[PDB]
UniProtKB/Swiss-Prot annotation, chain A:
The rodlike tail sequence is highly repetitive, showing cycles of a 28-residue repeat pattern composed of 4 heptapeptides, characteristic for alpha-helical coiled coils. The lineage of its organism: Eukaryota, Metazoa, Chordata, Craniata, Vertebrata. Belongs to the TRAFAC class myosin-kinesin ATPase superfamily. Myosin family. The cardiac alpha isoform is a 'fast' ATPase myosin, while the beta isoform is a 'slow' ATPase. It comes from Homo sapiens (Human). This is Myosin-7. It is found in: Cytoplasm, Myofibril; Cytoplasm, Myofibril, Sarcomere. It comes from the Eukaryota. Myosins are actin-based motor molecules with ATPase activity essential for muscle contraction. Forms regular bipolar thick filaments that, together with actin thin filaments, constitute the fundamental contractile unit of skeletal and cardiac muscle. Muscle myosin is a hexameric protein that consists of 2 heavy chain subunits (MHC), 2 alkali light chain subunits (MLC) and 2 regulatory light chain subunits (MLC-2). Interacts with ECPAS. Interacts (via C-terminus) with LRRC39. The chain holds residues 1733 to 1797 of 1935 of the full protein.
């Protein structure tokens, strides 16, 4: 888009009514094209901004999903860790009884 | 209700800008109405460039804001996958230990019956 000082210069060249009609129409073309392109680019950058805001919110919502999924996973892992410890104790106890009964069987086998 | 412009008007519409351009085309136009029309274009353009610059800087901040949000989302999703994989591993080891305990329970009864039979043989 034209800078305000360049727009002003076109305005001041158009201030002379003695200006040649070829440069008069040329300057009028400059303002016309510049303004049409300006409104187009303005509208373009406007919708770009509204979409970028939706882009932010979607990213934040994908972050809300991810952080909550992680937290649930961490809690479930801790719960299973507690349950695993209990089961390890049961297996250790059952292993010791297996050894005890293995020893008892050998004694019985030697006595028969 | 634009507050960048004179009055509550917003930017000139392309047809209104064009009408002013066609008023400056008249060689009979009064020099006072020529200066008036040039003033219209001047005020409108300065006010429009002001609002344009503001929405311009707004865009760069949303762009940095997007990437920071997406990268904090990349992190969060990576954290979640790490957590879920650890949860899966804990589930597998818990399943293995539950299988081991069931096996040992079956073995205990088997040996209990064996002991009884052997003891009855004494």
């Amino acid at each position: 888009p034209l800078k305000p000082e360049e727009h002003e210069d076109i305005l001041n060249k158009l201030l002379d009514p003695e200006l040649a009609q070829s440069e008069r129409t040329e300057a009028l073309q400059q303002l016309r094209v510049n303004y049409g392109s300006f409104v187009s680019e303005y509208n373009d950058l406007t919708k770009d901004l509204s979409q970028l805001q939706t882009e932010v919110e979607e990213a934040v919502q994908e972050c809300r999903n991810a952080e909550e999924k992680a937290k649930k996973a961490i809690t479930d892992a801790a719960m299973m860790a507690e349950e695993l410890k209990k089961e390890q104790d049961t297996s250790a106890h059952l292993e010791r009884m297996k050894k005890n009964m293995e020893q008892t069987i050998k004694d019985l086998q030697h006595r028969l």
